[model samples]
Target: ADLEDNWETLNDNLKVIEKADNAAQVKDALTKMRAAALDAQKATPPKLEDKSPDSPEMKDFRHGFDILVGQIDDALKLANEGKVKEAQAAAEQLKTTIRAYNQKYG
Candidate 1:
């Protein structure tokens, strides 16, 4: 799935980060992380600030997005902790869960 691929990409970059051994290498990894975070932020479902929470479809989509965003945040946090492997695992789980949740309503 799309999210699995995203996680794979993230972990692959993390592996690069892991093997970094010098200032330039670390900077490159950090740059990669920053870019990845921005990409994730942009690709994530938009926040429904303007929509009323009482609407049915809005409610489901809101819940779905919340689930996805929660996991996304968690993944980024784990990555910040330098636990990219764990973060990727968590992200993969999020992808599966979100896929199921959205298949019902997407």
Candidate 2:
């Protein structure tokens, strides 16, 4: 599928977060990260074969992606609310997750 492309886009967005100098920049980058992850989710097949989507492997990958996207969303919310420290912490975690995803699936 489009996994590689989506991962690349997400990695780039993570860089944007890493280098963000202000809340506005972090929010914008989080928005981009969320969109990139959403696109990745859309492109992924729910099942590798005829297996149920609830299969452990499928559920694990989906949950991992969900966590990353959820963190990005929360980071955006924190930034909007002027919680700079918490927002940056969440962004850092999002970046770490993206790296793990690439290492695992790239």
Per-model C-alpha lDDT, please? 0.51, 0.67
lDDT of 1 by residue, 1-106 (tens): 4645545655665565456543334345545655554454433334332355555565555454555556555555555666655665554564466466663232
The alpha-carbon RMSD values of the candidates against the true structure, listed in the order shown, are: 7.8, 4.4
Residue 22 lDDT (model 2): 76
| Cα TM-score per model | 0.41, 0.63
Residue 12's lDDT within candidate 1 is 60
Model 2: per-residue lDDT, tens digit, 61-83? Answer: 66766866786788788889986
What candidate 2 gets wrong by more than 4 Å, as runs, is 43-64, 98-106
